[PDB]
Every structure is written in structure tokens, then in C-alpha cells.
Amino acid sequence: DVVMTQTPLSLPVSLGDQASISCRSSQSLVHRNGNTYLHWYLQKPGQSPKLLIHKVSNRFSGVPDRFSGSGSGTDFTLKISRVEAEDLGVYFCSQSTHVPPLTFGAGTKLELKRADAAPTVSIFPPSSEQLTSGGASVVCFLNNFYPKDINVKWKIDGSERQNGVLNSWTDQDSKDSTYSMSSTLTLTKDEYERHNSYTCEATHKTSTSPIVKSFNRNE
């Protein structure tokens, strides 16, 4: 099968900027009939994909002329002359020269740039309600940070625990263009009563050193 490789995976831009995204195929998409079946789609947040460009450079009906497609052989580019808010979302390329199967690139997310922002980190011991039922979840929120990449570790009595972690991430905030993350470490009550020192530790561009929030079970 043909592999479609899209770069970059994420492209932060400011409104009004030009944007260029790349799609490379593992072999030539020039069909024996002379056509090059390379297409571009946009999937806006919470929607189904919509076709933008077909056969390299043909703009689909209703698509504004700020979108253009170019390239040949194995190397293709979608350009947006001036990015608008409504253009934000995930762009996919696809090929239908070599079928079956038709194949897709992994997507490039066009997102908004803003100033770097350190996460606001908050840590929460288990509730009395949960402890009553025999469980013990510890929660860490890492909120309103930028850029989007972040790493979290849970450290209990000075040692990392990997088992029982559930992470979730928000999409880029509609108001301030930041990102947020929730990390929940679920223990049994017995495990919780075995150790008293709980730390949520993050790495992020905004600090050379780990960012930490902690509590002591014994108050």
C-alpha cells in the first residue's frame, strides 16, 4: 500500500499568516492514465471532513481561492494565502492512484499561535466519599499552558508510579488559545494508606526544571 506522510504534524499560525503544509507519498501518484489522484480534506473541530482540493490543484465547489494545491510525483503542498479562524482544523491528504486501498496522511493540525504560558498546576487528594468505597484517586490538573506538548509523571514517596494513570487533554481553548490536561492516578485505599508523599511532576517548554505540585496525606 502507499504511505502518505504529512508534515508538520502541528502548524501553529497567527490569523492572517500564510500557511503551507506538505504531503509526500511513498511512490509516484501519477497514474498510467495521466492523472494524479492526490486530494486534500479539512476536518474542522467537531465536524466530518470536507473536500478542499482534488487531483492536486482542482478546488472543489465552494472552496475559497485562498486555498491552492500544488506539487507532482511524490511531493505535494497545500497553501493557504491568508489563514482565517474558519480554516483551523485538521488537514488530510489522500491518494487514490493505487487502489485498493485508498490511503490517507495522518493529518496536520492547523492551530493558533500565542505567547508561551506555564501551566497552572493543582493537585487533589482522594475525596472522603471515594475512600469510603475503598478507592483512592489522586488528580492533577495542568491548566492553560502553551505550547501544547507536556509530560506528566506521578511520584509517590519519591518513586515514579506508572500503573493506574488516566490522562485527558482539551483542544485549544476558544478564548485564550491555551491547552489543558487532567491526570488521574487511581490507587486502592490500601495503596493510598501505604505512602504519604504525592507529587504530580510535569516537564514543559516554559521551564528547564520539572514543574511540581505535592501534598502530604497526613496533612
Partner: protein, 203 residues
């Protein structure tokens, strides 16, 4: 130009089958595409609505069956021997041009289970939260103070792990707002007729 209306969410056990429909209106081969949790797209196959000829991705050819009902302008995708890898959003696509709204399929051994809702109280601004644990199926809804508190809220996408969902939400307010005023998360899980209000109290 063509509108594609897909059927609603499906829940199936491992090893079971699913059948989803796609009703076309307006005025091309009908394709089916899977969107995986990481957003990647995989083409399943296509069918000619006219005569009924089909083409399949070898990955899905052993389990997928595409059909069309010409009299009702409806296309169907049947997928058997389901695994957790099949938990995804399935799209029908007319001529690879127009996409349906998608149909969610969740493949899990889970039975319907009401959420447990836990307050997250702190150890110039204060962050509180609400942990909604151990429920099935989606969705739950969560608001703060009956929806009157909407700014400074982050409600995180639900995540399925070990065949139960967890969701959480944080809310950040000025320190003079709480506990001087009340903050309550309102959680609803219609599948279990659950409606709970959890007031956040100082520890």
C-alpha cells in the same frame, strides 16, 4: 450537494457484529472510512449503488460486507468479529466527496454503569474540580452551578480505560468567590437515569 445521514451510536461486545446505515439524498460509489481515536483515517471499502459491485481493503475484506438498498437510497456497512480496534467513528462518503456525519461504534464487554461523582477540593484564584468515574456508556453531561458558571471551566474528554469511562472537570474562580459562595458540579448520565449534584466543600 448530496447529504448523507448516518444511523446513531452503536455498542457491541467483542466478537459481535455491527450494522450501520447511510441514507443518501440529493443527486457515485459509496465509500466507508474508519476514523480511529488518534484521528487517523482508514478506508474500508466501496460499493457501486447501481449494480452492487464492491472493492475492499484487504485489512477489512474478511469481516466487512457492504450493501445498498436502491429503493431507499440507503447504504449499509456490516462488520463482524468486532475487537477493541473497531471502536471508532465510521463515515460513509459519496464519491470520496461528501461525508456523512459519522457513526460511533464502541466495542466493549461493559454493562451500563452509573458514574461515581467525587468532589475535588483544594489541598488569588482557586481551582476546584469534579471527578466522574466508572461509568458506561457515553455520554455524561457536566455543568457547574446549573450552567451559570461557564468561564474558567475545563471539562476534559471522557477516556475509556479497562472498559469504564472517566471524565473530569476543573473550574477556577477568584479566591473571594469560594467558599464564600457555593460551587456545585451537576452530572447527568441518561443511560442510568443518573442526575447528581456534588457540592464542593473545604476539606
Amino acid at each position: 450537494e448530496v447529504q448523507l445521514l448516518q444511523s446513531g451510536p452503536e455498542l457491541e461486545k467483542p466478537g459481535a457484529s455491527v450494522m450501520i446505515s447511510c441514507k443518501a439524498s440529493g443527486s457515485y460509489n459509496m465509500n466507508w472510512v474508519r476514523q480511529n481515536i488518534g484521528k487517523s483515517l482508514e478506508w474500508i471499502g466501496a460499493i457501486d449503488p447501481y449494480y452492487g459491485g464492491t472493492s475492499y481493503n484487504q485489512k477489512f475484506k474478511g469481516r466487512a460486507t457492504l450493501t445498498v438498498d436502491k429503493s431507499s437510497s440507503t447504504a449499509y456497512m456490516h462488520l463482524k468479529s468486532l475487537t477493541s480496534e473497531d471502536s471508532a467513528v465510521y463515515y460513509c462518503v459519496s464519491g470520496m466527496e461528501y461525508w456523512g456525519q459519522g457513526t460511533s461504534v464502541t466495542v466493549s464487554s461493559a454493562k451500563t454503569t452509573a458514574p461515581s461523582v467525587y468532589p475535588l477540593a483544594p489541598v488569588s484564584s482557586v481551582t476546584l474540580g469534579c471527578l466522574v468515574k466508572g461509568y458506561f456508556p457515553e455520554p455524561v453531561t457536566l455543568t457547574w452551578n446549573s450552567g451559570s458558571l461557564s468561564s474558567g471551566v475545563h471539562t476534559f474528554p471522557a477516556v475509556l480505560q479497562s472498559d469504564l469511562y472517566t471524565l473530569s472537570s476543573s473550574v477556577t474562580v477568584t479566591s473571594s468567590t469560594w467558599p464564600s459562595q457555593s460551587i456545585t458540579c451537576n452530572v447527568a448520565h441518561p443511560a442510568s437515569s443518573t442526575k447528581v449534584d456534588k457540592k464542593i466543600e473545604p476539606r
